[PDB]
Amino acid sequence: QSITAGQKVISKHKNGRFYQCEVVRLTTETFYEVNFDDGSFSDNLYPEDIVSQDCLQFGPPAEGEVVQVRWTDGQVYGAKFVASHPIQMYQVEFEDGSQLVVKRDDVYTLDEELP
């Protein structure tokens, strides 16, 4: 089942419960993968988290390129760029006006049983 924009669906609100919501847009989110200098691996960096070069302006680093990364703790780490992969996601709006950007697997059609 493809999900299309304008479709009523069911997904989890920010309060953690399933509600009907409406798909307002199909977006593409690009995630970066890097190997930190200590060998730990991240698969979901945003391009703007690369702080050794301007990837929002000039695209991803070359594969294997040395980079510095601003992590979710606000600190900067050395790493090496592994890959980038774009992911189709679904911007949904709930009855209260709140919105989320979610993965295909987190969206359910009205006809289907919920987990």
Numbering used by the authors: 897 to 1011
Reported in the publication:
In all the structures, KDM4A-DTD forms two lobes (HTD-1 and HTD-2; HTD, hybrid tudor domain) with interweaving β-strands. KDM4A-DTD, which displayed strong binding to H3K23me3 as well, also bound H3K4me3 and H4K20me3, consistent with previous findings. KDM4A-DTD binds H3K23me3 peptide at low micromolar affinity (Kd=2.2 μM), slightly stronger than its interaction with H3K4me3 and H4K20me3, and KDM4C-DTD displayed highly specific binding to H3K4me3 (Kd=6.8 μM).
